[PDB]
Amino acid sequence: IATINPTTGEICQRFKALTPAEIDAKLAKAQEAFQAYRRTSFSQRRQWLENAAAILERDTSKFAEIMTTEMGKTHQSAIAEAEKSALVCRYYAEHGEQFLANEYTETQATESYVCYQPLGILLAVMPWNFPFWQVFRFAAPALMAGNVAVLKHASNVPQCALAVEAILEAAGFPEGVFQTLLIGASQVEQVIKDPRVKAATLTGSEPAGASLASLAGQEIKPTLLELGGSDPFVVFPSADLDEAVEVGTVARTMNNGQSCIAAKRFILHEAIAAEFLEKLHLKFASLKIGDPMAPETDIGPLATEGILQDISRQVDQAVAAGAKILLGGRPLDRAGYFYPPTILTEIPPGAKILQEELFAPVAMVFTVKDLDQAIALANDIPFGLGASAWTNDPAEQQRFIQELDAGAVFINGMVKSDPRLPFGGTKRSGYGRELGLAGIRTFVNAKTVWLK
Amino acid sequence: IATINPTTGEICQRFKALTPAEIDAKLAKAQEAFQAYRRTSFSQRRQWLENAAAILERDTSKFAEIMTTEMGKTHQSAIAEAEKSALVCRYYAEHGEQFLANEYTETQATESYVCYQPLGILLAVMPWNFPFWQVFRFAAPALMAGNVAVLKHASNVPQCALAVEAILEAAGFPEGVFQTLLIGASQVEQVIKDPRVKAATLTGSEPAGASLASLAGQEIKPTLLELGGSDPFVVFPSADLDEAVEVGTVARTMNNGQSCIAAKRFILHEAIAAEFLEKLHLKFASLKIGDPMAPETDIGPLATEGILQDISRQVDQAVAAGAKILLGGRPLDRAGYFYPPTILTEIPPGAKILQEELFAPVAMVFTVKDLDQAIALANDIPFGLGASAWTNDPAEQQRFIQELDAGAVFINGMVKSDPRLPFGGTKRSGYGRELGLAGIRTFVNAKTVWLK
C-alpha cells in the first residue's frame, strides 16, 4: 500500500497494512457504532451528508490534487470528480427518507406494508480509477439508509481512501460509521467472513469481483458488482458525425482511457466510416499528453506500471496478429506510465483483443453494413455495461434501445452515470444497480409487515 | 431421483438422471426458446399464465395427490398449495406488464427512463416441502418478465417436478420456456457454470444455497436465496391468548412442521406463560396423526427417512442435555416416517438445539420477563426469515415491528406468504425478495435509457 506518482514513477508515501487483529477491532467498533447509528433520524443523516457535500464543494482542488498525485487523472477531471461526489451526497440527503418510506399494500390486514431497515456493516471494495466518486456513489445511500461501512480501497490510492474517511468524520458521522481499511486484496476474505459484516459491494475488475461474490455467497451475504466493459459506440449514416467524433473522443480518452464506460469499440456504418475515422484520427492526434496537473493536458499517464504493461502487450499482440495501427500503439519514451491515444483498425476475426477490456486510450474501430450487423458486433463481448449509438432515425433508435445487451443505452450521447438514474451492468459487467432509488434499496432489509 | 412414499417407506418410481450432454441439450433448447420468447407480448404471456392457473384450479385434487404421495403433506394442505400456486400465476398475469412498464425520470435528456428486460435462462433449485408453490412463486414472475427457466427440483419430488413442466406446456408456453431437469445436487454446478445461464434462485437449506451462491458469484451471476428459519412466536400479556394458541399450533404444525416460516420458538411473557403453555400442550396432544390422504389427518409423516433421523437426533440430544419433554419427543412405532407433535421446555442455556432449525412439529418453549428480553431471545439465532408477535399494546407492536430481526413481522397473526407482498429472509435465511413488485424485478436487466 503506497502512493507512487504515475507522472514521475516516484514512491511518495508507504503505508502499513492493518493486521488481522486491527481489522477485527475496526469491525467491533463498526458493530457498536451501528447499534447507535441505526437509531439516528433521517434529518441527522441528511445534515451530516450535506456537511460532507459542503466539504467536497469547498475543497475540490485540494481533493482533486490527491487524486491526480496518486493515480494520474487530469487535475481538471479530478475537480469534476469531487463535484460529482458532492452531488450524489446531496441527492441522497434530499431523497433518502422518501425513498425509504413505508410502502402500503391493501390486504385483509388492518395494516400491511413494506418498511426498509439497514442491514448492519457493509463492506465496500473500491477501485483506483474514480477514487472519490465510486466511494461516494456507494457511501451516500448506504449511510442515509442507516448502515455503517468499512472501505477497502485500491492499494495505490491510500491518501484518497484516508481523505474520504476524514471528510465523513469532519462532516459529523460518528466514529465507526465509516472506516477506511488500509489492507491488501488478500485481506478482504477476513472481512467478508466476519459474522458482523452483512453485505458487500465491489467496483473494479472480474477476478476481484468473482472472489468477493464467491466468498459472500458461501456466507449467504448479498452483493452488488460493478465490473468492466467494452462499450460499443455505434455511428450510423443519419448521425451528426462532427458531434459523434468529438463526443467519441471524449468517451474514449476521458480518465486517460480508464473508465468502465469508456467508448472502447467504435462501430461505424460503411456509408460514414471513412469521414468518421479520418476525423477521429485528427482529434486523437491533437490531444495534449503530459503533466495531469497542467490545465491544458488532455492525457495524463496510466495509473500504474502494471496498467501500462497490460495495454502494451494487448496492443502488441493484436498488431502482430495483423491489426493495423492507424495511430499511436507504442508507449512514450518519457518518465511516467505514459501510453498514447491509439487507433487500431482491421482487427482480424478471432483476435484475442476483441474480447478484452482496453483500460487505456485505445480505440478499436469496425465497419458494418447494416443495423443487424452493428447489434451483433456490439453484443459480441463478455461484458455488458454501457452502449452508445448515433442515429436520428426513430426506428433505429428503438432497435438500439431494445437490442443492445447493456445496462445503459445512450442515443446521440456518451454513456454517463447520473445520481438521478440507476447505473449498473449485465453479463460479465456485474449485477445490481447504484444511484436512483435502486441505489438506496440495495442494502436494506425490505421487511414485510402485517398487522391484524 | 425417486418417489419414495413417506406414509409406507416404499419406493414407487425410480427416475434416470440426465447425462451432462442431455443437460447441455436442454440449455441449447432454452437459449433458442429464449430468443423467440423474449419477443412475445405481455398479452400472450398473460394468456398462457392464466391457462396454467385454470389447469391448477381444475385439478387441485389430482396435483395434491401427487404432492401427498411423494412428500407426505396432508391432501387438504396440498389442495391449498395448488390453489395458492394458481393465485400467484393470476397475480403476475394481471400485474406483470404494469410492474415492468418504463419508469421516466426528468433530466436534460429528451427522454430518460429505466426499462425492464429479461436476462435469459434462469436456473431454479427448489425444495420438496412446497413442491408446487415454491416453483410457481418463482416461475410466474420469471416467465411474465420474458425469461426462460430450467428447474432442478428436489430428488424426492420428481413427479411434482414433471407435473409442473407439463402444466406450463399444456397452458401453451413454448417448448424450452420451462424445462424440468431430473438431475442430482452434484450436477447443479454444470448448469450454473454454463455461459447461457444468466442467474439462479434457490429455495431450500443453507448447504445447498451456500454452494449455489458461491458458484454463481464466481461466474458473476446474480442469485436469490430463500433458506431456513427458526421463527419466534412471541406472546405478551395483552394478547388474545386463545387465538394465539390456535394460530401458533397451526404455525408450528402445518406441513407436518416442515416450513421455513413455522413458529419454532414460542416466547412467552411470564404473566401469561402457564396459561398459554397448558393450552398449547392440550392443542398438540389432541392433533390427529395418520394417513395424509385422510381429510381428518392433522399430521402426516415427515418427508424422508433422513428428515426423521435429523429431528430424532436433535431432540434426543436436547433431552440428554436436560431439556424437558412436555409432549411427544419420540418417533411413533408404525410404518412410514412419523414423528409426533412435540413440546420441549426448560432447554438449558447454550444447548445446541437453540441454534438449529427443527423441520418437524417440535415446539421449543421459553419464558421471558419483558419486551427487551423477548427481542434479544427472538433474534438470538443465525436465521432471520419471519417473526410473529402477539400484543394489543400499540407501543409494543411498534417495538416488535422495528426490532425483530426478520424479513417479515406479523402482529397478532402467523407469518404467511402472499403474492401481493414481498417475501424473503435476512441474516442466514438469505437475501432478495419473491412476490409483489420485487418478485418480477429480480431477474431483469433494469436498463437505463437516455436519448438526447
From TrEMBL, chains A, B:
Name the positions where NADPH 2 binds.
126, 137, 152, 155, 205, 211, 226-227, 260, 357
Keyword annotations of the record: Nucleotide-binding
Residues recorded as binding NADPH 1, renumbered to this chain, are: 126, 128-129, 152, 155, 204-205, 226-227, 357
Q: Which segment of the chain is annotated as a signal peptide?
A: none
Residues reported to bind NADP(+): 126, 128, 137, 152, 155, 204-205, 226-227, 357
Q: What is this protein called?
A: Succinate-semialdehyde dehydrogenase
